[PDB]
Amino acid sequence: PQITLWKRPLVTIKIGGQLKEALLDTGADDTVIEEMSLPGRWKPKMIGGIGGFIKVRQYDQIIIEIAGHKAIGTVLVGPTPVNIIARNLLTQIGATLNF
């Protein structure tokens, strides 16, 4: 689809079989999700935002459906008010910005 920005660009995602709401965010590099259980090992990762840096958990090759499109890639787990789908997965489902 085409998504205007008068409202937050919120979509449904499916992960570990659960439907969740998420934000499409072109300012973030790697997807970040609220605490949940994910399979396999994780690795530490530093992410910087508006207030500074934080430590989160990095999981690789996680399967996720975004607005009905299939993606597999890195998901970070850490403290956020909402799930953030970032450039890493937005590129996999062919999203681009247009103006």
**Catalytic (active-site) positions:** 25
Question: Are 26 and 87 contacting, i.e. CB atoms less than 8 angstroms apart?
Answer: yes
d(CA 8, CA 58): 26
Nearer to ligand DMP, 47 or 67 (CB): 47
The entry of ligand DMP, its own copies, none near residue 1 (CB within 5 to 8 angstroms by kind) is its own copies
Question: Are 23 and 85 contacting, i.e. CB atoms less than 8 angstroms apart?
Answer: yes
Radius of gyration for the chain, computed over Cα atoms and rounded to the nearest angstrom: 13
Name residue 59's beta-bridge partners: 75
Q: Binding residues for ligand DMP, per CB under 6 A?
A: 23, 25, 27-30, 32, 47-50, 80-82, 84, 86
Q: Binding residues for its own copies, per CB under 8 A?
A: 1-9, 23-29, 32, 47-54, 67, 69, 78-81, 84, 87, 90-91, 93-99
